[PDB]
Design a protein around this ligand. Structure first.
Ligand SMILES: Nc1ncnc2c1ncn2[C@@H]1O[C@H](COP(=O)(O)OP(=O)(O)OP(O)(O)=S)[C@@H](O)[C@H]1O
Ligand SMILES: Nc1ncnc2c1ncn2[C@@H]1O[C@H](COP(=O)(O)OP(=O)(O)O)[C@@H](O)[C@H]1O
Ligand SMILES: [Mg+2]
Ligand SMILES: [Mg+2]
Ligand SMILES: [Zn+2]
Ligand SMILES: [Zn+2]
Ligand SMILES: [Zn+2]
Lengths: 207, 438, 668
DNA sequence: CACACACT
DNA sequence: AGTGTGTTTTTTTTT
């Protein structure tokens, strides 16, 4: 198991400008932004599958590292070009890759808002190290990539009902029902923006 | 095996026709009885079945679910053979089987994931009874475009239900056979809920309840709040959580754990004899003092008090005048005195003597709607009328505790109800009036 | 060596020599070698004993006729540990292998014990690491680990399809039975007869059914950092394992970290989140005391037949009653009469029933009046943990609905549901009552009602249920102003109702008297309590142990655990009977009781007081532990009750009454 | 029951 | 072209 590559996460500390709850416009997509959010509710740890395997028993062939954007997505066909099947795919839970995630939402503070704006809550993506790094109920200084998050149930994946806006022509990735979005941020690094009563511990720890 | 199944049916009819004791074939006896009074139902004891033939009983125990319909068919054929002249569907309704086990009763608590679809013997107290629900014994259908009309005779012995017919079956569609609900013959079913053995008192465990079903000659036999020793097959169906389905019971026999007889329809189970000695006790004036002394054991006296109690329990006669008026029969006795004087004890004893009403307490009884509370039904936002104590006490001599401790204001609402001998409610836009003979 | 079903050396078995660990374990050759080693150490490996403790559990569970097969996870790492690591990494397959080896051991120790349980479970007790819900990482997935949670749901136990046979409507009448994970639908969606997709239905052929009980878990708030919401992971109980607990009782268990899919979770989250479960291979409660081995496993306390022989031996020893009086709450110096009362309440009277319906309570309602700071709450705390089944009533905190009987509207089920009445919790055990003289009066009347019948009857919100309440209760009260005035009548010293003191069989009053040398002893005694309480002082702990041993010698000669087991033995087997009695002694007693209530300092004496005396006699006889009541023990019961009555009187009449009863007092 | 979608 | 699937605050009642 050690041979299997351990995924890379690169957290950015000491970033020049902190945009805080302000800024965060649409023109920037996939952009590195530093936000001084006041995250007091956070979320629960979530497995957040990264990659996985598929059985596709009737071809007997096996995928490797299936990636899905936001909704559980299956291979386009059976891994074997023979018995290529757009009808059936079954998970093989073999290439299972997971990143402990916590949908932390940040409510804006009281200061730095001119006119009593409500504590606007923006969910922020969190990583397993970041989840443990982040202490909930505490306002945090954090930065990371600002990605466009689509609205839920929009994909025509099986099980989840597709969300039946304006769209382009010439696309064929999703020809019908269009799609709608609700952007959320991803923070690569997070820091908080805002005992030991034993004789041996006292002697060793104290200067 | 269908021929083998018919052979098993023949074996069962050989059982019933040639099982006798002292030359007496009890089965044909109850058969002719159920012919004279047309109850298409038959009672059998499995001990008798084992005595006649173990093998048939074992086949029963293997999978009763489908053995029972064969037995019902056998009984129906037997009734046709006996009660109908030779060479003379729905012409004769099918008889249904009644069984008494006398085996051990597994508690409702600690029932296993095993015993699925297995005949079991239990006991519990009813907490709720469902209204009647018809069941398609016979089904009348027509093939829509094909116009083909056919008969279906579905039994309630599977699982859930049989799906509607598919294809033409001699395209007419995935369900051409549209049910015409006129020739189709139905039998009512009733759902039951048993509390687990109030005597078992599983310490710290909320009493689990299971659902049941009853057939036309089983439904409405007993009321809620009454304990019954049941003999019915353990039953499972899907409510709509993986591979878990609703546990319930399909009953093959009903016996009263409380053992109390049903609503007395004046049929004298005491018969002429017991009532004859009852009148003899009435004939002998000394027996009045006998009843007086017998009431309230260990009380040490208070005999005139006991006489008053006996008279009250005895029931004052309600005379209905030719006028719109009507003489008020029942009376309510008032108990005032020093505490620790067995007064509440005597009340409890008297209520135990006469269960036509229910012992309660003021604080224990809901202040609102003591006579009859109004509650919002879970599936109807309208606040329905729930029967309060004096609804239950109606038709019964009732004892209640802590009158003084009770809030006075609603006790005012009690005197009017007892005075009128009814309970008139116009609250919440609902003008129902219920009798209070207590 | 074989490609499948092989036997190899332990070392070649240990190293996967393959890219994937789980794939290497997947080889049935490796599995069979592990099976050989498993059977080998199961009986052959007799750790620390001449006999294999696992073999001892075998045919003992056979005698128990159960399916668990507890392992303790020890003697596994101790037995070459490769199997231990293999289990810790990829359990499920070698759990199945353990079930097989259980089969062979089964038919070995007990032939024909097969077909009793078609399977024999694995029960992995204990674990190297306790872990936390905050500790659950993607590494922890699909690995059995001990956890630290609080049971919350305990859903209705449901039989679940151990095997499932899926068949299509058109082609397959019956298809082969395949195992069901009970976590999600198998949904094969393929017919052996029809290659094309078709409508599928379950097969009517019967397959095995196993119990199913879902429970929500919760991290311990004390262990949880402040201000942090504990995580909640779902756990499902299975057959031979369901109904092991009570909701909120809280447990630590080792189980595989199941992971499942559900599209609704992704929808509400907008992300490829995957639903995670655990189902403990073995269950053990976490009561939270962690004092001893009782914490491990389920519940606490014990019962020993050697202990009951000791109880018999002390029972025939005389002076046992006085030792018990000294035994109850030794940490409260003095209060000899109070100790007597509370101890006999712990023993409790003999329940009596007449004609089936007429009944007499076997429980004792102690009324205590105590000055503030008189250990009343601490007396109650010593009382509890001594009578096993116990409850505490804060008095002011509880109410009429809360303590006696409560109904709770349940939005999740959509109907009114019963809420646990704390007095129902009192039922079957001792009932502690505190701060009662200050709490609500309507609640007091509710308690009166409940105690009168030893049962609580509630008819509201469509719930007409009635619950038995068999509980020996002990009310704690403070005098008017905290100080009882002996010259003042008791009723004037009491801010509560007359009827409640009437229904109370035992009255207790605490007063402050001169007791100088006694106050010396009491202050010294509290100093000693502090000193033994202080960790800072063979060693210091040894001298603390020896001083508590000697104090146990003077007071509480029986050990407190031995004491509570003595009480358990008394309730379980001892049932003293009034076969012999003194009718006219009690007659003259109640006669003297009369024409005394005429005194302004005297409360009325009624029949229930006499029944109280009778049940005090029963409690004394149970305290004597003889199966037959003793006349003179009953005499001491009379003495205690009459002394309580005399104390209840005004001091002015109290002296005249004590002279009058002196004709009774000397007989004791 | 029975008619717009999404491929069948 | 197969065949599947979806639409009908108030007011007592506690307390
Ligand atoms: N005359 C009597 N004969 C026999 N037992 C009696 C007598 N008077 C009182 N008792 C006993 O004293 C107990 C006290 O009565 P309870 O059943 O508690 O109810 P109660 O007499 O109504 O008391 P209150 O007023 O409710 S506190 C009775 O249960 C009897 O066991
Ligand atoms: N005789 C005694 N021996 C030892 N401690 C005692 C004694 N009497 C009172 N105490 C102490 O008094 C304290 C107060 O007890 P508590 O019941 O809480 O008081 P209150 O009387 O205010 O209800 C306890 O900590 C207990 O140890
Ligand atoms: Mg009373
Ligand atoms: Mg206290
Ligand atoms: Zn394929
Ligand atoms: Zn047709
Ligand atoms: Zn098929």
């Amino acid at each position: 198991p050690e041979q299997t590559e351990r995924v890379f996460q690169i957290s950015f500390f000491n970033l020049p400008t902190v945009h805080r709850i302000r800024d965060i416009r649409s023109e920037k997509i996939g952009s590195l932004l530093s936000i001084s959010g006041t995250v007091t509710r956070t979320s629960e740890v979530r497995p957040e599958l990264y990659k996985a395997s598929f059985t596709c028993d009737m071809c007997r062939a096996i995928v490797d590292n299936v990636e899905q954007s936001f909704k559980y997505t299956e291979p386009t066909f059976c891994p074997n070009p023979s018995c290529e099947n757009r009808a059936f795919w079954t998970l093989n839970v073999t290439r299972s890759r997971f990143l402990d995630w916590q949908k932390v939402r940040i409510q804006e503070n009281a200061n730095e808002i001119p006119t009593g704006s409500m504590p606007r809550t923006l969910d922020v993506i969190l990583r397993g190290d970041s989840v443990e790094r982040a202490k909930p109920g505490d306002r945090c200084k954090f930065t990371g990539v600002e990605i466009v998050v689509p609205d839920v149930t929009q994909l025509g994946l099986p099980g989840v009902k597709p969300s039946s806006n304006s769209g382009v022509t010439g696309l064929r990735s999703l020809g019908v029902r269009d799609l709608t979005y609700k952007i959320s941020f991803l923070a690569c690094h997070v820091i908080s923006i805002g005992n030991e009563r034993d004789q041996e511990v006292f002697l060793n720890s104290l200067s | 095996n269908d021929d083998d199944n018919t052979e098993i049916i023949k074996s069962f009819k050989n059982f019933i026709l040639e099982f006798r004791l002292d030359s007496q074939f009890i089965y044909r006896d109850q058969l002719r009885n159920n012919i004279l009074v047309k109850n298409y139902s038959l009672t059998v004891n499995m001990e008798h079945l084992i005595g006649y033939n173990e093998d048939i009983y074992k086949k029963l125990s293997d999978e009763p679910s489908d053995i029972i319909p064969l037995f019902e068919t056998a009984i129906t054929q037997v009734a046709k053979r006996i009660s109908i002249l030779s060479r003379a569907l729905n012409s004769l309704p099918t008889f249904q089987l009644i069984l008494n086990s006398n085996a051990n009763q597994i508690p409702l608590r600690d029932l296993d994931s095993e015993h699925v679809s297995k005949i079991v013997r239990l006991s519990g107290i009813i907490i709720s009874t469902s209204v009647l629900s018809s069941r398609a014994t016979y089904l009348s259908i027509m093939c829509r475009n094909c116009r083909h009309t056919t008969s279906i005779t579905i039994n309630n012995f599977n699982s859930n239900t049989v799906s509607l017919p598919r294809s033409c079956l001699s395209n007419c569609g995935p369900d051409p056979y549209i049910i015409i609900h006129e020739s189709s013959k139905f039998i009512d079913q009733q759902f039951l809920k048993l509390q687990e053995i109030p005597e078992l008192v599983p310490v710290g465990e909320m009493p689990r309840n299971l659902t049941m079903t009853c057939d036309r000659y089983l439904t409405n036999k007993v009321i809620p709040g009454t304990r019954v020793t049941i003999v019915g097959i353990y039953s499972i169906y899907n409510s709509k959580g993986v591979a878990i389905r609703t546990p319930y019971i399909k009953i093959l026999g009903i016996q009263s754990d409380v053992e109390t007889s049903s609503i007395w329809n004046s049929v004298t189970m005491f018969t002429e004899e017991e009532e004859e000695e009852f009148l003899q006790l009435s004939r002998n004036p000394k027996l009045y003092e006998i009843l007086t002394n017998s009431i309230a054991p260990s009380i040490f006296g208070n005999e005139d008090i006991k006489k008053a109690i006996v008279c009250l329990l005895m029931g004052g006669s309600k005379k209905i005048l030719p006028d719109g008026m009507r003489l008020r029969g029942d009376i309510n006795v008032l108990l005032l005195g020093d505490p620790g004087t067995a007064k509440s004890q005597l009340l409890k004893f008297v209520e135990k003597v006469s269960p036509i009403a229910v012992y309660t307490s003021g604080k224990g009884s809901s202040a609102a709607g003591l006579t009859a509370s109004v509650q919002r039904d879970p599936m109807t936002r309208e606040f329905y009328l729930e029967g309060g104590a004096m609804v239950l006490a109606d038709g019964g001599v009732v004892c209640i505790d802590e009158f003084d401790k009770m809030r006075d204001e609603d006790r005012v609402a009690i005197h009017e109800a007892m005075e009128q001998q009814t309970i008139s409610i116009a609250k919440a836009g609902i003008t129902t009036v219920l009798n209070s003979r207590t | 060596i074989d490609p499948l079903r092989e036997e190899l050396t332990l070392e070649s078995l240990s190293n996967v020599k393959a890219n994937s660990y789980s794939e290497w374990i997947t080889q049935p050759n490796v599995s069979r070698t592990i099976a050989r080693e498993l059977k080998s150490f199961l009986l052959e490996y007799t750790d620390e004993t001449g006999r294999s403790v696992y073999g001892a559990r075998i045919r003992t569970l056979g005698e128990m006729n159960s399916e668990s097969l507890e392992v303790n996870y020890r003697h596994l790492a101790e037995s070459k540990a490769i199997l231990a690591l293999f289990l810790a990494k990829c359990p499920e397959e070698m759990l199945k292998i353990f079930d097989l080896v259980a089969m062979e051991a089964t038919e070995l120790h007990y032939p024909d014990y097969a077909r009793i349980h078609s399977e024999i479970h694995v029960r992995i007790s204990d674990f190297p690491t306790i872990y936390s819900l905050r500790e659950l990482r993607e590494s922890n997935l699909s690995s059995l680990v001990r956890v630290t949670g609080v049971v919350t749901r305990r859903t209705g136990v449901f039989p679940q399809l151990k095997y499932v046979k899926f068949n299509c409507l058109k082609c397959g009448s019956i298809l082969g039975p395949f195992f069901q994970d009970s976590n999600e639908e198998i949904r094969i969606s393929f017919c052996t007869n029809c290659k094309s997709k078709g409508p599928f239905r379950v097969n009517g052929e019967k397959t095995v059914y196993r119990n199913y009980q879902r429970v929500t878990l919760q991290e311990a708030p004390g262990t949880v950092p402040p201000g942090r919401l504990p995580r909640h992971r779902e756990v499902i109980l299975l057959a031979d394992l369901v109904d092991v607990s009570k909701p909120g009782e809280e447990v630590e268990v080792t189980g595989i970290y199941k992971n499942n899919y559900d599209g609704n979770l992704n929808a509400k989250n907008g992300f490829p989140v995957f639903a995670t479960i655990i189902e403990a291979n073995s269950i053990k409660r976490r009561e939270g005391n962690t004092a001893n081995e009782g914490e491990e496993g389920l519940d606490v306390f014990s019962w020993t037949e050697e202990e009951e022989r000791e109880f018999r031996k002390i029972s025939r020893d005389r002076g046992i009653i006085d030792k018990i009086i000294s035994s109850m709450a030794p940490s409260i110096y003095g209060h000899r009469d109070i100790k007597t009362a509370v101890a006999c309440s712990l023993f409790g009277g003999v329940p009596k029933n007449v004609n089936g319906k007429h009944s007499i309570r076997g429980d004792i309602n102690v009324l205590l009046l105590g000055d503030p700071g008189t250990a009343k709450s601490q007396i109650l705390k010593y009382v509890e943990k001594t009578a096993h089944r116990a409850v505490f009533a804060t008095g002011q905190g509880a109410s009429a609905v809360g303590l006696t009987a409560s109904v709770r509207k349940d939005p999740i089920t959509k109907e009114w549901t019963l809420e646990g009445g704390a007095l129902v919790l009192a039922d079957k055990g001792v009932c502690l009552i505190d701060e009662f003289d200050k709490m609500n009066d309507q609640d007091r009347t509710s308690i009166h009602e409940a105690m009168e019948q030893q049962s609580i009857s509630i008819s509201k919100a469509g719930i007409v249920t009635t619950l038995q309440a068999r509980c020996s209760i002990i009310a704690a009260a403070n005098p008017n102003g905290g100080r009882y005035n002996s010259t003042l009548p008791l009723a004037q010293n009491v801010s509560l109702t007359e009827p409640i003191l009437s229904r109370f069989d035992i009255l207790c009053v605490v007063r402050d008297l001169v007791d100088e040398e006694a106050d010396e002893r009491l202050a010294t005694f509290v100093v000693d309590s502090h000193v033994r309480s202080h960790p800072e002082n063979l060693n210091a702990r040894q001298r603390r142990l020896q001083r508590q041993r000697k104090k146990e010698e003077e007071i509480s000669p029986i050990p407190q655990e031995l004491l509570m087991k003595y009480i358990h033995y008394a309730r379980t087997k001892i049932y003293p009977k009034l076969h012999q009695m003194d009718m006219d002694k009690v007659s003259r007693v109640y006669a003297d009781l009369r024409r005394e209530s005429i005194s302004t300092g005297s409360f009325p004496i009624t029949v229930r007081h006499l029944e109280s005396i009778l049940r005090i006699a029963e409690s004394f006889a149970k305290m004597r532990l003889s199966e037959f009541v003793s006349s003179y023990d009953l005499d001491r019961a009379i003495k205690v009750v009459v002394d309580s009555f005399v104390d209840a009187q005004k001091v002015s009449v109290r002296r005249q009454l004590r002279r009058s009863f002196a004709i009774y007092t000397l007989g004791h």
